[PDB]
Amino acid sequence: NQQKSLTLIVALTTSYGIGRSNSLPWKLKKEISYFKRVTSFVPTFDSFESMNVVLMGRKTWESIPLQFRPLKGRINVVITRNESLDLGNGIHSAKSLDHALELLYRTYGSESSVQINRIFVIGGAQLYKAAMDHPKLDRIMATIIYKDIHCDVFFPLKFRDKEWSSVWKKEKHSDLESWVGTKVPHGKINEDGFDYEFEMWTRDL
């Protein structure tokens, strides 16, 4: 198992809502563009050898548009307890998150040209719950949607809340930029009648 820290990436409403009907309930081209920069960005000196990983629960797998997967420029892994068959061409599936990480280490060791850079968990709610409890999860890339859209699926831990304020802290914008490496818009962004904003929350292991 593990060596490296985990990063969770989520887009949620102020009520912690994350989806409805096996879909993320909004249409945001610039917010989806953000997901893509974060999840495929590796430093220049390292982009040479290094590739990122996206860990996801299979309903999130399903939920993705046939057109966009396997997500490109990334190692895709699907967490499924009933790993029967996985339709893909180099797409891994694992029994759980620790299984996914031994799998990757094993598979991207010394007999490889492709090294792992950063590891991201992309959801859904059941995979977000297990990560939140992993001793290696130390950062949450969150996109806050300033609107109470109807959702039926919720993020499992109210991390921006008063109850978690001694563990999870919001980081300065300048450090969110420095971590993702692309400059990023500060404050509210308006796209299709929705208000949103990017944040970076961190905890000490």
Ligand X SMILES: NC(=O)C1=CN([C@@H]2O[C@H](COP(=O)(O)OP(=O)(O)OC[C@H]3O[C@@H](n4cnc5c(N)ncnc54)[C@H](OP(=O)(O)O)[C@@H]3O)[C@@H](O)[C@H]2O)C=CC1
Ligand Y SMILES: CCc1nc(N)nc(N)c1-c1ccc(Cl)c(/N=N/N(CCOC(C)=O)Cc2ccccc2)c1
Q: Does 82 appear as a known binding residue?
A: yes
Q: Which is nearer to ligand Y, 32 or 130 (CB)?
A: 32
CB of 72 to ligand Y, least distance (A): 6
Q: Catalytic: 176?
A: no
Catalytic annotation present for 24: yes
Among candidates 1, 17, 21, 13, which has minimal Cα distance to 135?
Answer: 1
The verdict on whether residue 106 carries a ligand-binding annotation is no
The reply on whether position 117 binds ligand Y by CB under 6 A is no
Residue 22 contacts which entry, ligand Y, ligand X, none (Cβ below 5-8 A, type-dependent): ligand X
Near ligand Y in 30-69, by CB under 6 A? 31-32, 34-36, 60, 63-65, 68
Q: Which of residues 6, 24, 116, 137 is near ligand Y by CB under 6 A? A: 24
Point out which residues pair with 6 in neighbouring strands.
Answer: 119, 137
Q: CA dist 168 to 10, 165, 172, Å?
A: 15, 5, 13
Tell me if 143 contacts ligand Y by CB under 6 A.
Answer: yes
* Phi-psi map region of 16: left, alpha, beta (phi>0 left; psi -120 to 50 alpha): left
Is 60 one of the annotated binding-site residues?
Answer: yes
Question: Least Å distance between CB 29 and ligand Y?
Answer: 8
Burial class (CB in 10 A: 0-12, 13-18, 19+), 166: exposed
Q: Which stretch binds ligand Y (CB under 6 A): 4-12, 131-139, 155-163, 179-187?
A: 4-12
Q: What is the phi/psi pair of residue 67, to 5°?
A: -55, -40
Tell me which amino acid residue 88 is.
Answer: G
Which segments of 90-203 are extended strands (E)? 92-94, 115-121, 137-145, 153-154, 169-170, 189-191, 194-202
Annotated binding site for NADP(+): 11, 17-23, 58-60, 80-82, 123-130
Q: Which residues bind ligand Y (CB under 6 A)?
A: 9-11, 24, 31-32, 34-36, 60, 63-65, 68, 71-72, 122-123, 143
Annotated binding site for substrate: 31-36, 74
